Design an enzyme around this catalytic site. Structure first.
Site, PDB file in Angstrom:
ATOM      1  N   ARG B  24       4.752 -10.580 -19.930  1.00  0.00           N
ATOM      2  CA  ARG B  24       5.556 -10.999 -21.077  1.00  0.00           C
ATOM      3  C   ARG B  24       6.507 -12.153 -20.751  1.00  0.00           C
ATOM      4  O   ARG B  24       7.341 -12.512 -21.586  1.00  0.00           O
ATOM      5  CB  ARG B  24       6.353  -9.819 -21.624  1.00  0.00           C
ATOM      6  N   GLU B  61      16.460  -4.209   7.103  1.00  0.00           N
ATOM      7  CA  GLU B  61      16.426  -3.655   5.754  1.00  0.00           C
ATOM      8  C   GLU B  61      16.322  -2.137   5.773  1.00  0.00           C
ATOM      9  O   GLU B  61      17.043  -1.467   5.036  1.00  0.00           O
ATOM     10  CB  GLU B  61      15.275  -4.234   4.932  1.00  0.00           C
ATOM     11  CG  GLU B  61      15.368  -3.843   3.460  1.00  0.00           C
ATOM     12  CD  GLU B  61      14.030  -3.953   2.738  1.00  0.00           C
ATOM     13  OE1 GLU B  61      13.025  -3.410   3.247  1.00  0.00           O
ATOM     14  OE2 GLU B  61      13.990  -4.603   1.673  1.00  0.00           O
ATOM     15  N   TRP B  83      17.808  -9.848   0.284  1.00  0.00           N
ATOM     16  CA  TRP B  83      18.373  -9.247  -0.930  1.00  0.00           C
ATOM     17  C   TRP B  83      19.493 -10.081  -1.564  1.00  0.00           C
ATOM     18  O   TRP B  83      20.068  -9.691  -2.583  1.00  0.00           O
ATOM     19  CB  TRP B  83      18.907  -7.844  -0.649  1.00  0.00           C
ATOM     20  CG  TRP B  83      17.836  -6.799  -0.640  1.00  0.00           C
ATOM     21  CD1 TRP B  83      17.056  -6.442   0.414  1.00  0.00           C
ATOM     22  CD2 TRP B  83      17.428  -5.986  -1.743  1.00  0.00           C
ATOM     23  NE1 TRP B  83      16.176  -5.443   0.039  1.00  0.00           N
ATOM     24  CE2 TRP B  83      16.382  -5.151  -1.284  1.00  0.00           C
ATOM     25  CE3 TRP B  83      17.832  -5.888  -3.078  1.00  0.00           C
ATOM     26  CZ2 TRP B  83      15.741  -4.232  -2.116  1.00  0.00           C
ATOM     27  CZ3 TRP B  83      17.201  -4.969  -3.898  1.00  0.00           C
ATOM     28  CH2 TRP B  83      16.168  -4.154  -3.411  1.00  0.00           C
ATOM     29  N   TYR B 109      17.480   1.802  -3.562  1.00  0.00           N
ATOM     30  CA  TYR B 109      16.954   2.759  -2.582  1.00  0.00           C
ATOM     31  C   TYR B 109      17.997   3.583  -1.818  1.00  0.00           C
ATOM     32  O   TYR B 109      17.884   4.802  -1.744  1.00  0.00           O
ATOM     33  CB  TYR B 109      16.097   2.032  -1.557  1.00  0.00           C
ATOM     34  CG  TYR B 109      14.821   1.454  -2.112  1.00  0.00           C
ATOM     35  CD1 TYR B 109      13.728   2.266  -2.370  1.00  0.00           C
ATOM     36  CD2 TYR B 109      14.705   0.093  -2.350  1.00  0.00           C
ATOM     37  CE1 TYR B 109      12.560   1.745  -2.860  1.00  0.00           C
ATOM     38  CE2 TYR B 109      13.546  -0.441  -2.842  1.00  0.00           C
ATOM     39  CZ  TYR B 109      12.476   0.389  -3.100  1.00  0.00           C
ATOM     40  OH  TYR B 109      11.315  -0.142  -3.588  1.00  0.00           O
ATOM     41  N   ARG B 149       4.809  21.630   1.956  1.00  0.00           N
ATOM     42  CA  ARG B 149       4.068  20.625   1.183  1.00  0.00           C
ATOM     43  C   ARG B 149       4.970  19.854   0.215  1.00  0.00           C
ATOM     44  O   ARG B 149       4.472  19.116  -0.660  1.00  0.00           O
ATOM     45  CB  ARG B 149       2.899  21.278   0.428  1.00  0.00           C
ATOM     46  CG  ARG B 149       1.820  21.891   1.364  1.00  0.00           C
ATOM     47  CD  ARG B 149       0.694  22.591   0.583  1.00  0.00           C
ATOM     48  NE  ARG B 149       1.150  23.837  -0.038  1.00  0.00           N
ATOM     49  CZ  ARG B 149       0.654  25.044   0.228  1.00  0.00           C
ATOM     50  NH1 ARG B 149      -0.348  25.178   1.089  1.00  0.00           N
ATOM     51  NH2 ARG B 149       1.136  26.116  -0.392  1.00  0.00           N
ATOM     52  N   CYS B 169       9.817  -0.562  -6.066  1.00  0.00           N
ATOM     53  CA  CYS B 169       8.362  -0.681  -6.011  1.00  0.00           C
ATOM     54  C   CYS B 169       7.772   0.509  -5.281  1.00  0.00           C
ATOM     55  O   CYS B 169       6.640   0.925  -5.571  1.00  0.00           O
ATOM     56  CB  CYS B 169       7.927  -1.965  -5.291  1.00  0.00           C
ATOM     57  SG  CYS B 169       7.855  -3.409  -6.355  1.00  0.00           S
ATOM     58  N   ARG B 189       4.005   1.450  -6.577  1.00  0.00           N
ATOM     59  CA  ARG B 189       3.548   1.220  -7.958  1.00  0.00           C
ATOM     60  C   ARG B 189       3.077  -0.215  -8.174  1.00  0.00           C
ATOM     61  O   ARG B 189       2.366  -0.516  -9.141  1.00  0.00           O
ATOM     62  CB  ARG B 189       4.650   1.541  -8.971  1.00  0.00           C
ATOM     63  CG  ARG B 189       5.875   0.631  -8.854  1.00  0.00           C
ATOM     64  CD  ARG B 189       6.744   0.575 -10.126  1.00  0.00           C
ATOM     65  NE  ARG B 189       7.864  -0.335  -9.878  1.00  0.00           N
ATOM     66  CZ  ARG B 189       7.821  -1.641 -10.116  1.00  0.00           C
ATOM     67  NH1 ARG B 189       6.736  -2.163 -10.667  1.00  0.00           N
ATOM     68  NH2 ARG B 189       8.866  -2.415  -9.828  1.00  0.00           N
ATOM     69  N   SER B 190       3.458  -1.092  -7.258  1.00  0.00           N
ATOM     70  CA  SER B 190       3.258  -2.511  -7.466  1.00  0.00           C
ATOM     71  C   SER B 190       3.312  -3.243  -6.138  1.00  0.00           C
ATOM     72  O   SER B 190       4.331  -3.216  -5.438  1.00  0.00           O
ATOM     73  CB  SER B 190       4.319  -3.065  -8.427  1.00  0.00           C
ATOM     74  OG  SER B 190       4.211  -4.468  -8.546  1.00  0.00           O
ATOM     75  N   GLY B 191       2.220  -3.913  -5.800  1.00  0.00           N
ATOM     76  CA  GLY B 191       2.149  -4.598  -4.527  1.00  0.00           C
ATOM     77  C   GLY B 191       1.691  -6.029  -4.649  1.00  0.00           C
ATOM     78  O   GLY B 191       0.541  -6.307  -5.015  1.00  0.00           O
ATOM     79  N   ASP B 192       2.616  -6.943  -4.382  1.00  0.00           N
ATOM     80  CA  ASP B 192       2.290  -8.353  -4.185  1.00  0.00           C
ATOM     81  C   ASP B 192       1.510  -8.459  -2.874  1.00  0.00           C
ATOM     82  O   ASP B 192       2.095  -8.412  -1.793  1.00  0.00           O
ATOM     83  CB  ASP B 192       3.574  -9.199  -4.159  1.00  0.00           C
ATOM     84  CG  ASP B 192       3.312 -10.679  -3.945  1.00  0.00           C
ATOM     85  OD1 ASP B 192       2.181 -11.063  -3.584  1.00  0.00           O
ATOM     86  OD2 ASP B 192       4.267 -11.463  -4.119  1.00  0.00           O
ATOM     87  N   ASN B 200       5.726  -4.246   3.531  1.00  0.00           N
ATOM     88  CA  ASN B 200       5.834  -2.854   3.088  1.00  0.00           C
ATOM     89  C   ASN B 200       5.126  -1.855   4.009  1.00  0.00           C
ATOM     90  O   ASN B 200       5.600  -0.731   4.217  1.00  0.00           O
ATOM     91  CB  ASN B 200       5.285  -2.708   1.661  1.00  0.00           C
ATOM     92  CG  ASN B 200       6.004  -3.596   0.660  1.00  0.00           C
ATOM     93  OD1 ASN B 200       5.393  -4.130  -0.277  1.00  0.00           O
ATOM     94  ND2 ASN B 200       7.309  -3.766   0.853  1.00  0.00           N
ATOM     95  N   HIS B 230      -1.880  -6.635  -6.767  1.00  0.00           N
ATOM     96  CA  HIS B 230      -2.127  -7.935  -7.381  1.00  0.00           C
ATOM     97  C   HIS B 230      -1.900  -9.128  -6.470  1.00  0.00           C
ATOM     98  O   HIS B 230      -1.207  -9.047  -5.444  1.00  0.00           O
ATOM     99  CB  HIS B 230      -1.261  -8.084  -8.630  1.00  0.00           C
ATOM    100  CG  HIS B 230       0.200  -7.840  -8.381  1.00  0.00           C
ATOM    101  ND1 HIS B 230       0.778  -6.596  -8.512  1.00  0.00           N
ATOM    102  CD2 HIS B 230       1.192  -8.681  -7.999  1.00  0.00           C
ATOM    103  CE1 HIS B 230       2.068  -6.681  -8.228  1.00  0.00           C
ATOM    104  NE2 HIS B 230       2.344  -7.936  -7.915  1.00  0.00           N
ATOM    105  N   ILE B 231      -2.491 -10.244  -6.884  1.00  0.00           N
ATOM    106  CA  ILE B 231      -2.338 -11.543  -6.238  1.00  0.00           C
ATOM    107  C   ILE B 231      -1.843 -12.539  -7.281  1.00  0.00           C
ATOM    108  O   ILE B 231      -2.480 -12.711  -8.322  1.00  0.00           O
ATOM    109  CB  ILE B 231      -3.671 -12.051  -5.647  1.00  0.00           C
ATOM    110  CG1 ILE B 231      -4.107 -11.186  -4.458  1.00  0.00           C
ATOM    111  CG2 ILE B 231      -3.565 -13.516  -5.259  1.00  0.00           C
ATOM    112  CD1 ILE B 231      -5.550 -11.391  -4.081  1.00  0.00           C
TER     113      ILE B 231
END
Ligand SMILES: O=c1ccn([C@H]2C[C@H](O)[C@@H](COP(=O)(O)O)O2)c(=O)[nH]1
Ligand SMILES: O=c1ccn([C@H]2C[C@H](O)[C@@H](COP(=O)(O)O)O2)c(=O)[nH]1
Lengths: 285, 283
Positions: B24, B61, B83, B109, B149, B169, B189-192, B200, B230-231
């Site tokens: 968006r 970090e 950051w 975090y 568990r 992320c 949830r989201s990886g560049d 990561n 994603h790329i």
């Protein structure tokens, strides 16, 4: 290859190289950590066929979650008894929650989904407008910002664990939209391969069909990610039986009515077409 | 096979059949949904080699977040600046959080890990005994109930999202103990894939090394699970170059002294042995 074979291969992998460890139940399990399977939703519905899955339970429980209920009596009224052992005043007393009326599970799935972060009172309380409504959140994103990477619904609230009848196993689901299809990935921290996992595949596959319907999309894929995937020692004999069976083609799922909202679904809105499982396999606990 | 070939294969699949989508704000990615890779931690440390990973940043970090900090200045003062944009007053104003002093990231975090469910005030407040300390929670379980568990640490708190500089992320990690070894699964949830994912992998692999050390276990496996992998379209050309590179052997990680608490590690406690990456690539 038939997609059910992933699950059956995972069974074999656990039996063959799983770690033998004494677990909470004291029954003992064989387990592996970290698994992933992929189920198509486009042309069929992944209701497993090498045993009969309790579909009636799958449907009633999910609708019960979706409306925000934390009352096991409310599910029990529909004839589905699977939460009644946990909703008994005896079980709750055992959890250090003796003050609860029969049925009050605490802030479990329904409450986390519709009121994340709110202060739990009891199962009869009105929580309107309190906490973060994750169900509204994901439907709004799927409709208006479908490529967003934060379409998440999460049930794990560690601050609420001591108030829960049982800690959730299905930690979160994430949704994904591409080419007019809606996909879903479930992170499940703990999977009883025998009694739980086939039921769980069905639940989140159903959820995805429902969301797809409400948002004008077609169902895409369900991706099942497991943490502790385990076989209870008492299930080894029946599961070896199940491993001898060849999967039948999956059924199809039909939604019989235009349904505009996630909360307006009823069990009579779904029709399972050509579900032909091998017989029910009874397994202890 | 070299475990880095998983990451390279993931890159290839996304370039080959990833879905082409604009967000968006009008930026395009190729993406695939639902991925999983496994990195052994036993004999080596999975710091990727086909491009240099910012190890110094990875260490500072993680230590920063473990002590519960939501102050970007505390990280910046160590010489790690990743950051600082997020903690700038302009960025926070852009987020709708202009009241913040510079550096106040909100309940990111550090806060979720050490004080889950507490009411966030600001980065300078004292939150002792407030909320749920997930770090102490999982250390206790690994030590005293290792087959549990529910050894979970979760950063996703939807009620807090509006207060954060950026939504997390890395939504949660789960730990697992078997035969004297500690394993970890991350749900991201989201990886560049180009800039973020290698960093990561190192972060949660290091976390597992530290927890294993503190609890008297050996590092086992790190399982990396991705949602939206994603790329960015602008990264495709330099990634084509990276993909022509053969992975070199992974380094090893040694911890130099006996550390008894997750909070007592310092960057000096870690020696990275024989990390020989290909040159960093300009993306
Ligand atoms: O939806 C569910 C609920 C429970 N279980 C199983 C997994 C574990 O065997 C047990 C829960 O025990 P813990 O993981 O909380 O110890 O129930 C499932 O597989 N799916
Ligand atoms: O630790 C991180 C933090 C961010 N990202 C990337 C993923 C996305 O490209 C972007 C975050 O954007 P959203 O998914 O939140 O929209 O940064 C990572 O890969 N790893």
């Amino acid at each position: 290859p038939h997609e059910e074979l992933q699950y059956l291969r995972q069974l074999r992998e656990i039996l063959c190289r799983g770690s033998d460890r004494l677990d909470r139940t004291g029954i003992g399990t064989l387990s592996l950590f970290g698994m992933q399977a992929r189920y198509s939703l486009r042309d069929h519905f992944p209701l497993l066929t090498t045993k009969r899955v309790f579909w009636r339970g799958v449907v009633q429980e999910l609708l019960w979650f979706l409306k925000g209920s934390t009352d096991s009596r409310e599910l029990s009224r529909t004839g589905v008894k699977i939460w009644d052992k946990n909703g008994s005043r005896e079980f709750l007393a055992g959890r250090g929650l003796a003050h609860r009326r029969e049925g009050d599970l605490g802030p479990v799935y329904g409450f986390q989904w519709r009121h994340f972060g709110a202060a739990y009172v009891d199962a009869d309380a009105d929580y309107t407008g309190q906490g973060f409504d994750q169900l509204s959140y994901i439907v709004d994103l799927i409709k208006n910002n479908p490529h967003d990477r934060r379409i998440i619904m999460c049930a794990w609230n560690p601050a609420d664990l001591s108030l829960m009848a049982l800690p959730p196993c299905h930690l979160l689901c994430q949704f994904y939209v591409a080419d007019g299809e809606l996909s879903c990935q479930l992170y499940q921290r703990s999977g009883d391969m025998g009694l739980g996992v086939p039921f769980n595949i069905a639940s989140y596959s159903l959820l995805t069909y429902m969301l797809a319907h409400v948002t004008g999309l077609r169902p895409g894929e369900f991706i099942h990610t497991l943490g502790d995937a385990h076989i209870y020692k008492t299930h080894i004999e029946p599961l070896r039986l199940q491993l001898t069976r060849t999967p039948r083609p999956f059924p199809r799922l039909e939604i019989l009515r235009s349904v505009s909202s996630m909360e307006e679904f009823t069990p009579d809105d779904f029709r399972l077409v050509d579900y032909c499982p091998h017989p029910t396999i009874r397994m202890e606990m």
